[PDB]
Design a protein around this ligand. Structure first.
Ligand code: HEM
Ligand SMILES: [Xe]
Ligand SMILES: [Xe]
Ligand SMILES: [Xe]
Ligand SMILES: [Xe]
Length: 153
């Protein structure tokens, strides 16, 4: 369980993300695909993209980045009370997309790395720790739902 102080560190860096969610989403997805190429293969929509330049130029990829970060943002704003938000996400990612917990760990790493690079003013050691804790809680609860839904993850 995160403290209120920890949630505020999470929300204060997220306030900067929301200055330009599209730009942040591009950076995170590109980092994910570059650092772990196998994750791109899960996207039948995007696996044709060969280079970072093509990824950067993809309006469709930008749109999805916005969708992902807005969904995550809505979860973080619930400060742990995210049961309703997590249900449809868990089901689609378990049953349709088939996304292992390992891959959710990869995107968490991508999120942390981008926030660290972009936002040293609001992503110092305490803030990064709080964001890690929040993303760990996300993955923990998703993993629990995965098993309920009949997916190993
Ligand atoms: C930060 C954690 C993530 C969040 C909040 C998130 C959110 C979403 C949302 C809101 C959608 C659209 C509705 C839906 O299908 O549920 C979606 C679709 C999708 N997600 Fe995720 N996602 C996350 C991580 C991942 C990862 C790491 C992968 C693969 C490695 C992945 C694979 C996909 C795929 C393949 C789709 C369908 C794309 C399409 O063809 O339209 N997701 N995601
Ligand atoms: Xe993203
Ligand atoms: Xe997810
Ligand atoms: Xe996550
Ligand atoms: Xe979370």
């Amino acid at each position: 369980v995160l403290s209120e102080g920890e949630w505020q560190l999470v929300l204060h860096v997220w306030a900067k993300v929301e200055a330009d969610v599209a730009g942040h989403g591009q950076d995170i997805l590109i980092r994910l695909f570059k650092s772990h190429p196998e994750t791109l293969e899960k996207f039948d929509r995007f696996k044709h993209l060969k280079t970072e330049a093509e990824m950067k130029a993809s309006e469709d990829l930008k749109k999805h980045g916005v969708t992902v970060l807005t969904a995550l943002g809505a979860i973080l704003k619930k400060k742990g009370h995210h049961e309703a938000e997590l249900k449809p996400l868990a089901q689609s990612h378990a049953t349709k997309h088939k996304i292992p917990i390992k891959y959710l760990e990869f995107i968490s790493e991508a999120i942390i790395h981008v926030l660290h690079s972009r936002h040293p003013g609001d992503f110092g050691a305490d803030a990064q720790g709080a964001m890690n804790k929040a993303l760990e809680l996300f993955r923990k609860d998703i993993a629990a739902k995965y098993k309920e839904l009949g997916y190993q993850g």
